[PDB]
């Protein structure tokens, strides 16, 4: 860790394409069309058939970039002609997505997988500036789940006394509310972008993002607050699991004595549904961003986005990986030893996350079942959800990275 964190404006903008296997890329025309908004925008639990998770449209829009952004870079007319799985660019600005003609201007663009784009090869983008910067969070944030071998990455720091001043007013606004509704109005005041790195805006999202985290594995909590502030859930690992910003006067406050910096991932396909982790992912898109952040432990992403320069390293910050139903019970083991809950009531909880994490990967496992079996047989077919395999269930190293984490506070 610098004294000083990740100061500097950020100047690469690299894109990183979705992986895919034999049959290409694992998306179609009725899936893209399905991401887009009123305007044809790609850029603007309520599960679908076409998006059973909430992490669905993570993956998908990896997909959407992957296929429609990496073809247009050769110049300021490849948007003319320029079509893929049936669909054109209405501008040099890439504002809209629209039906192309067919049979097309030209032959039909051929995604490539899990590979490298200079995003300022765009002479739009490299003379407008602040119209790939403000599109960025959101290709950034396809670049870090392809990198990712399982689910997506969180950027985790704290700094001496990082919640006071008008921090600290900020957060007290928002006392009583809940974590993906504070993360989706941070996200709505960034959309005119200018977020400077240690800026307001930037400052928010990263003490935002490890209060929640250090409260999701139980560290913080309400006997163990940051300048008085911890969320707070009624359930644990569980259907229900809702985090409220609470503040407290009377219990200890955490002496944070220098900065701390992690990535943490999820390792475990729950990741799919839970909607706090991703929330947590998104604000941590714009977050880095803005930035150039830490770079990435080679181990840490996969073998196709290794020693990337501004990115990946030998040597780089390691990626800590959580189990998400290991860390709901060490949460909850946190919370009988603090005296939060009675021991028997720990136990109806680990349970209830138990059993709900039971149903979780037994929808996951057919829906990654039937996945795989379609995308190797049936031409054309849309993937739901990110490819897993069935190891991803274990603990892996979530105990390494509890231990991490744990010293965030000191």
């Known amino acids: 860790i610098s004294e000083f964190g990740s100061t500097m404006a950020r100047a690469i903008y690299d894109f990183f394409s979705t992986p895919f296997g034999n049959r290409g890329l694992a998306t179609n025309r009725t899936q893209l069309s399905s991401l887009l908004s009123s305007s044809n925008s790609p850029w603007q639990i309520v ?19 992957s296929a429609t952004v990496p073809g247009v870079l050769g110049s300021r007319d490849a948007w003319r002609t320029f079509n893929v799985f049936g669909l054109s660019w209405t501008d040099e600005g890439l504002s809209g997505l629209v039906a192309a003609q067919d049979p097309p201007p030209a032959a039909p663009y051929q995604p490539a997988s899990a590979q490298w784009s200079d995003l300022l090869n765009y002479p739009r983008w490299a003379n407008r500036r602040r119209e790939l910067q403000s599109k960025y969070p959101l290709l950034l944030r396809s670049t870090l789940l392809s990198a990712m071998r399982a689910g997506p990455v969180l950027y985790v720091e704290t700094w001496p006394n990082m919640i006071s001043g008008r921090l600290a007013d900020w957060f007290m606004s928002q006392y009583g509310n809940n974590f993906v509704d ?11 972008m200018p977020v400077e790195p240690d800026g307001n ?7 935002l993002i490890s209060l929640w985290l250090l409260s999701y594995i139980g560290v913080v909590n309400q006997t163990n607050t940051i300048s008085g502030f911890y969320f707070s ?6 259907a229900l699991d809702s985090w409220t910003l609470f503040y407290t006067t009377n219990t200890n406050r955490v002496q944070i004595t220098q900065r701390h910096f992690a990535y943490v991932c999820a390792r475990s396909p729950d990741w799919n549904v839970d909607k706090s982790w991703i929330a947590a992912a998104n604000l941590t898109a714009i977050v880095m961003a803005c ?3 830490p770079v990435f432990a080679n181990q840490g992403v996969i073998n196709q986005a290794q020693n990337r320069p501004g990115f990946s390293m030998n040597g780089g910050t390691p990626v800590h990986e959580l189990n998400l139903l290991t860390t709901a019970q060490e949460c909850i083991r946190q919370w009988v030893m603090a005296g939060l809950v009675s021991a028997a009531k720990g136990q109806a909880l680990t349970q209830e996350a138990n059993d709900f994490s039971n149903l979780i990967q037994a929808d996951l496992g057919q829906i990654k079942a039937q996945d795989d079996a379609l995308y190797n047989q049936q031409p054309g077919y849309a993937r739901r959800i990110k490819p897993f395999v069935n190891g991803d269930w274990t603990p892996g190293m979530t105990a390494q990275a509890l231990a991490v ?3 965030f506070t000191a």
């Open 47 to 65: 599960s679908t058939p076409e998006a059973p998770y909430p992490g669905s449209l993570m993956y998908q829009e990896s997909m959407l970039h």
């Open 182 to 192: 504070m993360c989706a109005r941070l996200t709505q005041s960034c959309s005119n």
């Open 201 to 207: 805006y930037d400052q928010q999202m990263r003490a």
């Open 233 to 238: 859930s009624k359930t644990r690992g569980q």
């Open 291 to 293: 930035r150039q952040p």
């Open 405 to 407: 984490l744990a010293t």
